[PDB]
Every structure is written in C-alpha cells, then in structure tokens.
Design a protein around this ligand. Sequence first.
Ligand SMILES: CCOC(=O)CO/N=C(/c1ccccn1)C1(c2ccc3c(c2)nc(CNc2ccc(C(=N)N)cc2)n3C)CC1
Ligand SMILES: [Ca+2]
Length: 223
Amino acid sequence: IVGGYTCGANTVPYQVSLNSGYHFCGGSLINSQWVVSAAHCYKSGIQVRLGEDNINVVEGNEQFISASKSIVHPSYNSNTLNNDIMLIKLKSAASLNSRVASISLPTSCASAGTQCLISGWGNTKSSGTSYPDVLKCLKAPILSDSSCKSAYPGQITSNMFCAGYLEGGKDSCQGDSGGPVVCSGKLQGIVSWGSGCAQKNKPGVYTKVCNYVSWIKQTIASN
Ligand SMILES: CCOC(=O)CO/N=C(/c1ccccn1)C1(c2ccc3c(c2)nc(CNc2ccc(C(=N)N)cc2)n3C)CC1
Ligand SMILES: [Ca+2]
C-alpha cells in the first residue's frame, strides 16, 4: 500500500496473508473454511495466515492453516487478467473470534464515489521496494467507468473497476494482490493489477466481486 497508514493490530479481521515461506499475496476470509483471493496469486504449497499484524513476528492471535485446494476461475485469462478471482479451501475451519472474522459478500454492486478500505502488506513505495512488517490501510473511492476506461483504453472488462486517486500518491501495489476492497462492510473488490503504483492517471484496477457472487456460492456448495 502506497500512501496509506498503519491499520492497527487486528482492525481488519478478515484480512489473510498467503504464505509460501514468505508473504506473496493477500486474501479475505468469507467463512470459517473459505478464502477469496486473486487467480494470479495461484501457487501450490499455500499456507493461509489469519489474525496477522506483524507478519515477521509471532505475536499471538495467528492461525496458520494449510490450503486443501485452490480453485482458480475456469475462465481466468492470464493475458488480460479477466476473471482474476480464486477460492481457497482451508484444510481445517478457522477459529472465528474478535480478531479473526469473515467479511460479507455484496448483494449489489457498489456505485462510483463509494469510499472503500483497501489493505495489505505490499510494497509501500512508488519508486523502489519497501515492504512493511505490519498491515497498511488505505481509504479510496470507486472511480467512474468512464474515467477508468479513459485511464486504461481497451484493458478494462466488465469484471473490473478502478479505485483510487488520479493525482497519484496513494494506491495498492505489488504484494497487495488478492487482498480486500471493502465498501460499507461488503467485499466489493480484489486487488488485481495496475500500471506501476500510485502513478498519476494510473489508478488501481480491481476484480468486481459482485459479478461473481453466484459463482462463489455454487462453487463453495459443491466442494
Ligand atoms: C511487470 C511485467 O508485466 C508485463 O510484462 C505485462 O503486463 N501486462 C499488463 C496488462 C494488464 C491488463 C491487460 C493487458 N495487459 C499490466 C499488468 C498486469 C498484471 C499485473 C501488473 C501489471 N502488475 C501486477 C502486480 N500487482 C499490482 C500492481 C499494481 C497495482 C496497483 N497500482 N493498484 C496493484 C497490484 N499484476 C498482477 C501492465 C499493466
Ligand atoms: Ca505475526
């Protein structure tokens, strides 16, 4: 997260860290046994780390659970990043409590202007690399489709939306991928891609979760 602030330990209880000997992507806990992340975060040997704040120190409240299976959307396209969404089933159910809780799926799509909270342990620098120990947060609005399409001509599909600041300076970045974009208590987006980080006229692009609620429910119900 570039230009954000320290969230504060366990203030984003649905935030998950995907780990394979190091943090590589974020995720959102949607129920005691399922996590939603980005398809481009797919990798074998995934350990889901819940209740984390400082990812480099065991401080208490952490739950490390192996993924029993990862389900990348069948229509995910690695070239266009269309349908960049993946479901991860935990080997065991997480212990839900004050510091580890699930986020609700939306019942309707969010409108332009809606303010949302984006979080993660990704790069905190626009020019260079600096990864934080603790979870960073950023409040950013959902941009209009016209502004989004004008920023990335021909690269925005109906399963994507832009959120952030055109003036640059505040944005999600590498390492934040797969993480949550929560608006009014509903998970509306998944950190997906962008051109650089926090660059002027190059806002972040996110997977439009509201287009996948039926798919998510049907898939979870059959696995
Ligand atoms: C770094 C090398 O990348 C390449 O060579 C190809 O990039 N190809 C594309 C592309 C996207 C959509 C449609 C067509 N082509 C891209 C692209 C595509 C996928 C990407 C990407 C950049 N960067 C990432 C890494 N994560 C990331 C980056 C920036 C973010 C942001 N600004 N909010 C949020 C997350 N991922 C994941 C240049 C914009
Ligand atoms: Ca920790």
